[PDB]
Structure 1
Amino acid sequence: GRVRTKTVKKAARVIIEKYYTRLGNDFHTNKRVCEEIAIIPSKKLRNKIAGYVTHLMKRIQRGPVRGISIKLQEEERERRDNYVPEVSALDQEIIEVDPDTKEMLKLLDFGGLSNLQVTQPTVGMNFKTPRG
């Protein structure tokens, strides 16, 4: 029976979204931060709030939490997502093209291209799955 009420969790998320730079992985440090940045009428509620802040702080360091939305955290994680390979995955040496697709390009100005490799069309129209 260690489930936190919505009072503990909501107040812990607002503290993070407003004072993320002051919090850490230590309960007793966050226990004193929440005591000052938030007027909690009880001490047990403060320890529950600060204890859940420490839990959420261990999740922020590994990834984004579905409840906490920090602007300075979302912008950096999106900026650091810019990953591209040394060579694109689209410009290939050879490209397999179905004979029906080859005819579509033939109607367009791109009739004959060296990058195109016509594949043998498989015989037998067994694409549908059996019924029942």
Structure 2
Amino acid sequence: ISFKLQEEERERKDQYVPDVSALDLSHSNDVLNVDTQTAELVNSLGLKLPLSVSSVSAVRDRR
């Protein structure tokens, strides 16, 4: 079942957009953590973005 009040409330909750940013490195002191491979991707793309190399420790968890 649905009605005008519930649908309006759902739409109002849907229109919620945070004023603060959840992207563009607002967190982690304007640093994103990427491994070497995607760093070479950024390099070969011809683009200079603020990166932070970190090895991914190719040893896999035994699960």
Equivalences, count: 57
1:83 aligned to 16, 39, 43, which one?
Answer: 16
More relative contact order, 1 or 2 (CA 8 Å, 6+ apart): 2
**1:25-44 paired onto structure 2 within 5 Å:** none
- Work out whether 1:117 is the aligned partner of 2:49: no
Measure, in 1, the Cα distance between the counterparts of 2:60 and 2:21: 32
Shift of 1:117: 1.7
CA RMSD after TM alignment: 2.1
Is the partner of 1:97 in helix, strand or coil?
coil
Structure with the higher fraction of residues in helix conformation: 1
Shift of 1:83: 2.0
Shift of 1:100: 0.9
Measure, in 2, the Cα distance between the counterparts of 1:69 and 1:79: 12
Measure, in 1, the Cα distance between the counterparts of 2:56 and 2:61: 15
Gaps of 5+ in 2: none
Q: Which amino acid aligns with 1:104?
A: L
Gaps of 5+ in 1: 1-67
Identity of aligned residues (%): 39
Is the partner of 2:41 in helix, strand or coil?
helix
Measure, in 1, the Cα distance between the counterparts of 2:32 and 2:56: 17
Structure with the higher fraction of residues in strand conformation: 1
Q: TM-score, normalised on structure 1?
A: 0.36
